[PDB]
Design an enzyme around this catalytic site. Structure first.
Site, PDB file in Angstrom:
ATOM      1  N   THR A   1     -16.687  38.751 -33.297  1.00  0.00           N
ATOM      2  CA  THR A   1     -15.854  38.266 -32.206  1.00  0.00           C
ATOM      3  C   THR A   1     -16.698  37.495 -31.207  1.00  0.00           C
ATOM      4  O   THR A   1     -16.383  36.360 -30.856  1.00  0.00           O
ATOM      5  CB  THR A   1     -15.149  39.408 -31.492  1.00  0.00           C
ATOM      6  OG1 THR A   1     -14.368  40.145 -32.439  1.00  0.00           O
ATOM      7  CG2 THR A   1     -14.232  38.857 -30.431  1.00  0.00           C
ATOM      8  N   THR A   2     -17.769  38.131 -30.739  1.00  0.00           N
ATOM      9  CA  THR A   2     -18.791  37.461 -29.935  1.00  0.00           C
ATOM     10  C   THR A   2     -20.111  38.161 -30.231  1.00  0.00           C
ATOM     11  O   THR A   2     -20.351  39.272 -29.753  1.00  0.00           O
ATOM     12  CB  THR A   2     -18.470  37.502 -28.450  1.00  0.00           C
ATOM     13  OG1 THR A   2     -17.199  36.886 -28.218  1.00  0.00           O
ATOM     14  CG2 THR A   2     -19.517  36.736 -27.687  1.00  0.00           C
TER      15      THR A   2
ATOM     16  N   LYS B   1     -20.126  46.528 -34.650  1.00  0.00           N
ATOM     17  CA  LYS B   1     -20.310  45.308 -35.419  1.00  0.00           C
ATOM     18  C   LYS B   1     -21.742  45.112 -35.884  1.00  0.00           C
ATOM     19  O   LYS B   1     -22.017  44.144 -36.597  1.00  0.00           O
ATOM     20  CB  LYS B   1     -19.883  44.094 -34.591  1.00  0.00           C
ATOM     21  CG  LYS B   1     -18.406  44.042 -34.272  1.00  0.00           C
ATOM     22  CD  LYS B   1     -18.085  42.809 -33.454  1.00  0.00           C
ATOM     23  CE  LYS B   1     -16.629  42.772 -33.037  1.00  0.00           C
ATOM     24  NZ  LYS B   1     -15.731  42.553 -34.200  1.00  0.00           N
TER      25      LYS B   1
ATOM     26  N   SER C   1     -15.705  33.980 -32.168  1.00  0.00           N
ATOM     27  CA  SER C   1     -14.680  33.156 -31.538  1.00  0.00           C
ATOM     28  C   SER C   1     -15.016  32.883 -30.080  1.00  0.00           C
ATOM     29  O   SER C   1     -14.821  31.768 -29.585  1.00  0.00           O
ATOM     30  CB  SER C   1     -13.322  33.841 -31.652  1.00  0.00           C
ATOM     31  OG  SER C   1     -13.301  35.046 -30.911  1.00  0.00           O
ATOM     32  N   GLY C   2     -15.526  33.885 -29.378  1.00  0.00           N
ATOM     33  CA  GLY C   2     -15.863  33.747 -27.981  1.00  0.00           C
ATOM     34  C   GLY C   2     -17.189  33.086 -27.706  1.00  0.00           C
ATOM     35  O   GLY C   2     -17.579  32.965 -26.541  1.00  0.00           O
TER      36      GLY C   2
END
Lengths: 220, 213, 191, 124, 201, 215, 204, 199, 199, 191
Positions: free
Chosen positions: C1-2, C33, C130-131
């Site tokens: 995600t980031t 993660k 994504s971020g």
């Protein structure tokens, strides 16, 4: 469909409702959603009701085969690893949302398995259609290391939130408590909703229906 | 994109009697998989002798009610008398057909007394066709209720059974029992049962609870 | 995600958020993660959850069998070469944003990047998810050559804190890991 | 658009622009018609020919259909536009109701066209 | 849905079923598909239930104004022509209408057929509906111009019964009218379950 | 509005003894991007009614403009009359339905709270023109998350005090911060009483993260 | 749809020490009947029947694949099949076509052979078994049959009132359906004898 | 698209079909034959698209002739028709499903005459009379109007005469000629090729 | 879909059409008339979809009858046909274009007989013979096989007899009956309604 | 493409790039995106080129007629209200990313933002365009309350230099403008 699980100070409590809705019509009023895997591991099922039956019987057949060969108790990480390896192979065409929970030698373990193959260990999970309603009861009123009376009161309260707020849910609440030495599977934990009594007598008698042709064949 | 329709559920029931008329409905407003409220009856009192029930898209049901109630006043201020039950049905068929190419998503049943004090039931499609019947059921669970009233009220498919007319007493418990069966199998059938009884003396009302899934 | 990884001289520093979404609902509120492969080699994963969990298990299978056969600790470049071969052959079926980082006795700390195409390149610092698009300008100006370990733990804390606050798909809590010759120091940070 | 009431009432109850138009009729040439039980016979007088004109462009008896004839008096410029509006209507009757036009029907069209035209705005 | 109409020496016979369905669900069994425009005209209902109910009630308005102006009643051919023109202005917008127009006229009997597409034809026999092709075969057999009245009743009554037997969308009861000299006269309305015992033995 | 560009999120509201309380956060999202982080999504209509909204925020400033003018012109008539909260709720319902019929809807969902003549009013207004009343309302994902928490109190206890109602909202705003990707830890609480309309400042929630140490 | 191509309706209902099953007789193609004697209930041993409804191909196909697997069972083992065992057998047969599925919904009703106890269940088109205690229904006109059975069923019913209840449940619901009808056959079984009756329904 | 008919009596089966082989708008052949023998008392009448009616129906014909040579006796009309239903149903969920509509007619010395009905989805039906094509919509209503289970074969022909004259009154296709068979204890018999002179 | 024909001679125009009013698969009316008069020497033959053939062709009929009353004389067949072409072409690029196919036949005292041809795109064609419908593909080849510009009207009828017998041999539609006109200096004359007995 | 406006106490500071693309070709290499409306009110435009040039001319028409009628210098909030009414009424036909900024005698420097929806809000600093997503994290950490004019010219120079280097649609040269009570100081910067 509303299934949920929690991890208290000694074991794991799982809960579910009993309704199968085909289309928008209630098909079954007492469908059991908590399944047998091993004498220490159970699973709750959600999604396609035929895919969850034929999956939860395949893995429970292999773990009976595995534990009888090794001669010792199964582990929860083995049932996690068998499920997410075969769901990834079918690329998500098998719709099966599972809540996996059990108490092995290493302790209590609770998993949630998504029908593409993604898993996660969590202290409390909810799956199903009315899972968002049941999450809010867990999210407001969870405390680590509760007693089993506080846990059973919490899960039945969360399943009831999926009863009175979701259309595709709501009947007698199932529960099951797994601990290190006790397995309390009990289907009618509470009856929140009844059926009203009939008022008008509709009773017919013999001979009120016209018959064209009758046959009688004896047996023994 | 923006779909201009949604289905809000609901189930209405009307039975014409000999000197009465009984209109009943549930009180659940709900779309999707969620519940909006547990109190929204569809019994609307038009006159002292005419009650309509409106199921379907709820935005049209609020609009169509207020269009009708204005024209009952415009009739009286132009003709010095209230509308009869048959005149309301003939007016409503022109209203529904007036939006023939963008229709209301409403099922309508008008129940009430005629000029002779007898029951009358006028059922509608969402386009504006109608006929006079003795009992109808519309809405979500209409396919469950219509077979049960053929056997009891219509006395169909029975042999050597007498044909007694439905009393006011028998029709109450026959209405109260057919919603309990519909509450079990339909997800949209609601929680409180509002029953409106149109007689020669006014309109009575009554609330009966149901299960609340 | 980031996700983010920065190397220093003695080793590398990794970091990621903990939010896992399903469209717009927060399915997993806290998420690990940072996946171990070997004792000194981690990966931080992004993209599809079901894909990157399945790929990281097969690489751990193949690298663990490889190191026990040579009887020698594996190279970081060896582990990054294994993700390349699975992400390129199955590039029509996967959504993987893997960053491979870790310490090695022969070469020290390394950072490799495998994006969704299936290529592989070594970088001084990597960034993905994504971020990650909202802190490209921050990570370019703030980065300074020759940091210590403690500065990189500060440098990955401030960068992840900005993407979590600005992006809607990121959030949760910050998980950190410092891989050196001595071992792995994991910590959970918030702020 | 010219909006003005031309025909209005008198203070004693007459419509002056109507009865002034009746005197324009009262000096046009004479048209006489009787009916027989099998053959109708109508004929205008005062052709007033000056022997240097085409005799057919001065005719005042025309036909609206095969069955309906028509004579007139007054001034000719207003006549042949009422006639051409009657020819359209008696033809549009046949696209409707299949029979040819009854003689009572085509008089009601001309008379109602002529009344509402003593009623509109800015029209003698 | 099955309607039929045929003219003979003693006027015109009109018959229809009474079943109106909604998908596979049957809405009603007592739908009157032969609506009464005048004491001297009749119209059938096929296709759109509300489309045939509106535009023929609008036709009955238009025929009444014709009588008050002209002081005689409209002919059958003129009445069908007014209906065909009103429907044509909504061509392509999706009206479903396949009705028939019956009635006595100054030229004798009258029988016309009006579609929503713009068909306007006369004729001797017609049959409209989903089960109309089941009605043609049994009607073409027993048809004559010189039928008697009791024979023309039993022809058109059984012909609906053979169509409701094969069609799934047709059923209910068999309405039956008779257009005569002075006006239409309602004959009967028999249930199919009553005719099944009659026509078997 | 064919496609909403800058949107809001869930708006809560519940009655209590002598008034209505409504809370909403202060974030204008753009897809998954949090651009505008200091906007206000609650309009204080004159003295006994109050409006919050979800959906497209540019359409909300339109209705903020139109309803603003309908209050300004009436109060300078000196009639001694004002709009009741259900009069505004009936107007705004007609404004939604008359605009979807032209196939050009306002992408909003609006909650109208109000305390007029000794009783509380709480009204829902949909984009499609669906309106109803309830003792508790919620839009967006709050209809799935916070709405079951509202009903389980109001069924076991029908009447609430103001401190009981204000406590019960902040619990529901906390849950929406955990389980919603379009939320933001900065909200404002608005409350009508008999005294008037009061809007509080940018309040914040307190989060718990003790389960993150559970591997 | 696909299930609405031929119609059909099968109902089973549990009694005191007896169980009854009923089905319609119509065979047709979407509007047009062909015959009124199409078999939809098939015998599987004594005191144990099965009903099939759905696509007319798979009704005759599954009823022959199942009999193929049943006779191999009753010869390899020396006994007759339990009603609970056949439910697992049919569910295995349908799930093999998980992606090529048969368009039918079976209904199984019969007595347990040693202890004469009734048994009813129903399955979806990919094999999810659902056992009940009152009634199961399958076919196109499903919702009309729930309004009958929820309003008429009594718990402990002799075979006389069991017959009259399932008859009025079928005749009133199938008459409200368009693509189902043309006669109703009723099998009511019990531990000593078996009974096949045909009802006087609308041929409409 | 094209028509055939199945009247079945007490000790006979009367079948008939048309003779027209069609094209785009023209008719290529006016005396085509839709009739395929397999045994001395079993016929086959196939309707459908172009390639499948020819090759499926002769695939069945070589399997029935093979059964007689391997055993010395013939199939029953029940078993011969039920062998066909297995072959469509197995080839239905395939890369090439056959699209044919058919009805089979047969006589046996044990159960007498028999008539079966099928479609392109392989559903059997033991019927007293049946028909395919668009003419079946016109002609089934005459046929159940006048059917008696005890009908003699002389009046069964003139019932078929009546059933085809209506087909040349209210049916838009041409269809001038019709070939007629009859099956009994003595086997297949050709009847008169009844037709209507278009001169 | 349905047929009409346009043989034109030295001092006559021989036209004919069918009489069938069709439906889905049945024929509703067997004696329909596709023939519309406008004057004593001008006909009109319209083919197309349902509503437009009736209402367009009688819209033209009320404009030709109006021209005769306003002036005392009739239109020429050239001008009457060319007035129709303006009305399709103006209504072509509209919200409701008419979809009709037609051919007009007329006699004049100045240029003699005349035949014009149109379609649903309003293209004129002065032709010696023409046809519409799917039968035009079958029947134009017989017609230019045997056409002489100096053909007498007795053998022009039997040419039309030959041109229709082939249409009942290799054309899949039914089409039993055909109505025939003839136009000359004396005006419209009805000829024999030629047909083929299907008994 | 990449536009930015920051206010300080005496006034505002604007900035934009100069690249205008047509898909992937550089049509205009240097471009003036800083459009004057009045003597103290600018706008910087983004999105469609043909739309924002047509809208900025109609607003200049309506505001110039408005100020000559009152005989009084216009308000910055008045000019931002005019872009709102055109971008909201024609929101189905426009692609406008307008940022309105300028000095006013009554209120000082103001910064308003009108995105593609048609809303309007006042901010301490605004940022827009396609390349603006890569410097959200930089502009959040680096921003400090109470800057001078010279710091804001530095602050908008460093932020635009990062988006131009990272985005492909941005680039060219940096155009700056400082609007105060005294006047407008425009400059063209590179670096």
């Amino acid at each position: 469909t509303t299934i949920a699980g929690v991890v208290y100070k000694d074991g794991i409590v799982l809960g579910a409702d009993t309704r199968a809705t085909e289309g928008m019509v209630v098909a079954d009023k007492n469908c059991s959603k908590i399944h047998f895997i091993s004498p220490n591991i159970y699973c709750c099922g959600a999604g396609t009701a035929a895919d969850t039956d034929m999956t939860t019987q395949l893995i429970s057949s292999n773990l009976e085969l595995h534990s009888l060969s090794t001669g010792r108790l199964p582990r929860v990480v083995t049932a996690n690893r068998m499920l997410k390896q075969m769901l990834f192979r079918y690329q998500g065409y098998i719709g099966a949302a599972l809540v996996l929970g059990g108490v092995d030698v290493t302790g209590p373990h609770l998993y949630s398995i998504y029908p593409h193959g993604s898993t996660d260990k969590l202290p409390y999970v909810t799956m199903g259609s009315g899972s968002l309603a049941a999450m809010a009861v867990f999210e407001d009123k969870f405390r680590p290391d509760m007693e089993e009376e506080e846990a059973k009161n919490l899960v039945s309260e969360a399943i009831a939130a999926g009863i009175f707020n979701d259309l595709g849910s709501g009947s007698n609440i199932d529960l099951c408590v797994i601990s290190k030495n006790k397995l309390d599977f009990l289907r009618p934990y509470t009856v929140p909703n009844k059926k009203g009594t009939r008022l008008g007598r509709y009773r017919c008698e013999k001979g009120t229906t016209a018959v064209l042709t009758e046959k009688i064949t004896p047996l023994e | 994109r923006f779909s201009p329709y949604v289905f809000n559920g609901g189930t209405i029931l009307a039975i014409a009697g000999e000197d009465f008329a009984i209109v009943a409905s549930d009180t659940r407003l709900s779309e999707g998989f969620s519940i909006h409220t547990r109190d929204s009856p569809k019994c609307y009192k038009l006159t002292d002798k005419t009650v309509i029930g409106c199921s379907g898209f709820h935005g049209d049901c609020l609009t169509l009610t207020k269009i009708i109630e204005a024209r009952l006043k415009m009739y009286k201020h132009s003709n010095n008398k209230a509308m009869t039950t048959g005149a309301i049905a003939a007016m409503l068929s022109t209203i529904l057909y007036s939006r023939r190419f963008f229709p209301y998503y409403v099922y309508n049943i008008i129940g009430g007394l005629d000029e002779e004090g007898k029951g009358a039931v006028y059922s509608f499609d969402p386009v504006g066709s109608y006929q006079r019947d003795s009992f109808k059921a519309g809405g979500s669970a209409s396919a469950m209720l219509q077979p049960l009233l053929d056997n009891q009220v219509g006395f169909k498919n029975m042999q050597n059974v007498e044909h007694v007319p439905l009393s006011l007493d028998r029709a109450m418990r026959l209405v109260k029992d057919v919603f309990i069966s519909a509450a079990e199998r339909d997800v949209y059938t609601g929680d409180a049962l509002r029953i409106c009884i149109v007689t020669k003396e006014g309109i009575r009302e009554e609330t009966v609870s149901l299960r609340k899934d | 995600t980031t996700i983010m990884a920065v190397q220093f001289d003695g080793g590398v520093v990794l970091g990621a958020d903990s939010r896992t979404t399903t469209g717009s609902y927060i399915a997993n509120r806290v998420t690990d993660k940072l996946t171990p492969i070997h004792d000194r080699i981690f990966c931080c994963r992004s993209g599809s959850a079901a894909d990157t969990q399945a790929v990281a298990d097969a690489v751990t299978y193949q690298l663990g069998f490889h190191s026990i056969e040579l009887n020698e600790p594996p190279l970081v470049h060896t582990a990054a070469s294994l993700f390349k071969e699975m992400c390129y052959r199955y590039r029509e079926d996967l959504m993987a944003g893997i960053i491979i980082a870790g310490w090695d006795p022969q070469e020290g700390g390394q950072v490799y990047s495998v994006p969704m195409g299936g290529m592989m390149v070594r970088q001084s610092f990597a960034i993905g998810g994504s971020g990650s698009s909202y802190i490209y300008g921050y990570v370019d100006a703030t980065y300074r050559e020759g940091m210590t370990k403690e500065e990189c733990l500060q440098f990955t804390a401030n960068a992840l804190a900005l993407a979590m606050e600005r992006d809607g798909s990121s959030g949760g809590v910050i998980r950190l890991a410092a891989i050196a010759e001595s071992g792995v120091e994991r910590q959970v940070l918030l702020g | 658009s010219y909006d003005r009431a031309i025909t209005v009432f008198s203070p004693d109850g007459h419509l002056f622009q109507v009865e002034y138009a009746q005197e324009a009729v009262k000096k046009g040439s004479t048209a006489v018609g009787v009916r027989g039980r099998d053959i109708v016979v109508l004929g205008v007088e005062k052709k007033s020919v000056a022997k240097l004109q085409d005799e057919r462009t001065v005719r005042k008896i025309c036909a609206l259909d095969d069955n309906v004839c028509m004579a007139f008096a007054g001034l000719t410029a207003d006549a042949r536009i009422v006639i051409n509006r009657a020819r359209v209507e008696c033809q549009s009757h046949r696209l409707t109701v299949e029979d040819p036009v009854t003689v009572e029907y085509i008089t009601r069209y001309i008379a109602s066209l002529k009344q509402r035209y003593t009623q509109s705005n800015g029209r003698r | 849905t099955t309607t039929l109409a045929f003219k003979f020496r003693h006027g015109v016979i009109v018959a229809a079923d009474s079943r109106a369905t909604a998908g596979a669900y049957i809405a009603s069994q007592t739908v009157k598909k032969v609506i009464e425009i005048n004491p001297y005209l009749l119209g059938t209902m096929a296709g759109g239930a509300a489309d045939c109910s509106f535009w023929e009630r609008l036709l009955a308005r238009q025929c009444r104004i014709y009588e008050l102006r002209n002081k005689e009643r409209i002919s059958v051919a003129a009445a069908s022509k007014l209906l065909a023109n009103m429907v044509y202005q909504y061509k392509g917008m999706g009206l479903s209408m396949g009705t028939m127009i019956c009635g006595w006229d100054k030229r004798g009997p009258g029988l016309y057929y009006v579609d929503s597409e713009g068909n306007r034809i006369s004729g001797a026999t017609f049959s409209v509906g989903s089960g109309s092709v089941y009605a043609y075969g049994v009607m073409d057999r027993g048809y004559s111009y010189d039928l008697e009245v009791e024979q023309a009743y039993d022809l058109a009554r059984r012909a609906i019964y053979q169509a409701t037997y094969r069609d799934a969308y047709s059923g209910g009861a068999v309405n039956l009218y008779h257009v005569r000299e002075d006006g239409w006269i309602r004959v009967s309305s028999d249930n199919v379950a009553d005719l099944h015992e009659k026509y078997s033995g | 509005t064919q496609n909403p560009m800058v949107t809001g999120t869930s708006v809560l509201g519940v009655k209590f003894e002598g008034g209505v309380v409504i809370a909403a956060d202060m974030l204008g999202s753009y897809g998954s991007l949090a651009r505008f982080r200091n906007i206000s999504r609650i309009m204080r209509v004159n003295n006994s009614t109050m409006l919050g909204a979800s959906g497209d925020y540019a359409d909300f400033q339109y209705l903020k403009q139109v309803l603003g003018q309908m209050v300004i012109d009436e109060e300078l008539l000196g009639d001694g009359h004002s709009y009741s909260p259900r009069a505004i709720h009936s107007w705004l319902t007609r404004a939604m339905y008359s605009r979807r019929s032209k196939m050009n809807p306002l992408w909003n969902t609006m909650v109208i709270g109000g305390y007029a003549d000794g009783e509380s009013f709480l009204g829902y207004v949909d984009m499609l023109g669906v309106a109803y009343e309830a003792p508790s309302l919620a839009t967006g994902y709050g209809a799935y998350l916070a709405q079951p928490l509202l009903r389980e109190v109001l069924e076991k206890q029908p009447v609430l005090s103001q401190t009981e109602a204000r406590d019960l909202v902040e619990r529901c705003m906390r849950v929406l911060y955990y389980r919603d990707a379009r939320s933001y830890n900065r909200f404002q609480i608005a409350t009508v009483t008999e005294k008037g309309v009061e809007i509080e400042g940018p309040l914040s929630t307190e989060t718990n993260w003790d389960i993150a140490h559970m591997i | 749809s696909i299930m609405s191509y031929n119609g059909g309706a099968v109902m089973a209902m549990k009694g005191k020490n007896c169980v009854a099953i009923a089905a319609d007789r119509r065979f047709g193609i979407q509007a047009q009947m062909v015959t009124t004697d199409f078999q939809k209930i098939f015998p599987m041993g004594d005191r144990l029947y099965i009903g099939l409804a759905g696509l007319a191909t798979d009704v005759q196909t599954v009823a022959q694949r199942l009999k193929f697997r049943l006779n191999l069972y009753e010869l390899k083992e020396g006994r007759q099949i339990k009603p609970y065992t056949l439910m697992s057998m049919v569910a295995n047969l349908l799930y093999e076509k998980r992606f090529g599925p048969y368009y039918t919904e079976p209904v199984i009703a019969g007595l347990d052979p040693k202890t004469f106890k009734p048994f009813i269940c129903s399955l979806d088109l990919i094999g999810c078994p659902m056992v009940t205690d009152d009634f199961v229904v399958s076919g196109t006109c499903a919702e009309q049959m729930y309004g009958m059975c929820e309003s008429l069923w009594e718990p402990n019913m002799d075979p006389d009132h069991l017959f009259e209840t399932i008859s009025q449940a079928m005749l009133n619901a199938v008459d409200r359906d368009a693509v189902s009808g043309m006669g109703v056959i009723v099998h009511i079984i019990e531990k000593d004898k078996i009974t096949t009756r045909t009802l006087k329904a609308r041929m409409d | 698209m094209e028509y055939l008919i199945g009247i079945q009596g007490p000790d006979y089966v009367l079948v008939a079909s048309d003779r027209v082989a069609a094209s785009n708008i023209v008719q290529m052949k006016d005396d085509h034959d839709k009739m395929f023998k397999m045994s001395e008392k079993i016929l086959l009448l196939c309707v459908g698209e172009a390639g499948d009616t020819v090759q499926f129906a002769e695939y069945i014909q070589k399997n029935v002739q093979l059964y007689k040579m391997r055993n010395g006796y013939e199939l029953s009309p029940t078993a011969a028709a039920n062998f066909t239903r297995r072959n469509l149903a197995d080839c239905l969920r395939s890369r090439t499903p056959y699209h044919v509509n058919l009805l089979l007619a047969g006589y046996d010395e044990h159960e007498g005459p028999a008539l079966y009905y099928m479609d392109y989805l392989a559903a059997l039906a033991k019927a007293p009379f049946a028909a395919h094509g668009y003419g079946a919509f016109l002609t089934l209503s005459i046929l159940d109007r006048y059917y008696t289970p005890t009908i003699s074969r002389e009046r069964a022909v003139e019932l078929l005469r009546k059933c085809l004259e209506e087909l040349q009154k209210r049916f838009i296709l041409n269809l001038p000629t019709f070939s007629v068979r009859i099956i009994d204890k003595n086997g297949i018999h050709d009847l008169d090729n009844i037709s209507f002179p278009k001169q």
